[PDB]
Design a binder for this molecule. Structure first.
Ligand SMILES: *[C@@H]1O[C@H](CO)[C@@H](O[C@@H]2O[C@H](CO)[C@@H](O)[C@H](O)[C@H]2NC(C)=O)[C@H](O)[C@H]1NC(C)=O
Lengths: 53, 53
């Protein structure tokens, strides 16, 4: 039982983030936790503060 | 060209893969089956007293 309940926590943790991603997608926004966004900072040279905008 | 500056188009990564980080509980009761197996084989030996005499 403890072996099962230890793995259940990871399922809950994934569920929370997946629900947040679904909300963001239904909201016509971008969830940057699921996307890298580090490759396009080098292709177009911008400051750290300009990338936040 | 003229006053306006032209910049190259940016290439885009086709796919991304999501591998979220998970907390590590580090429970110790699991993977302790060997102790239970040792408990199974106690093997107490009792010799009848009076059969020999
Ligand atoms: C799943 O089990 C593996 C193997 O026991 C765990 O990986 C270990 O994690 C600890 C803590 O970071 C490291 O010190 C070990 O070197 C890792 N071992 C191996 C073989 O990778 C992993 O943490 C477990 N997953 C969870 C979510 O607990």
């Amino acid at each position: 039982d403890i072996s099962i309940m230890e793995g259940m926590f990871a399922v809950q943790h994934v569920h929370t983030h997946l629900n947040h991603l679904r909300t963001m997608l239904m909201e016509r926004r971008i969830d940057w936790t699921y996307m890298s966004s580090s490759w396009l900072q080098t292709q177009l040279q911008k400051s750290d503060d300009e990338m936040k905008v | 060209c003229f006053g306006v500056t032209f910049k190259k188009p940016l290439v885009a990564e086709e796919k991304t893969s999501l591998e979220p980080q998970l907390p590590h509980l580090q429970l110790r009761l699991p993977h302790l089956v060997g102790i239970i197996a040792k408990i199974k084989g106690i093997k107490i030996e009792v010799t009848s007293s009076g059969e020999s005499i």
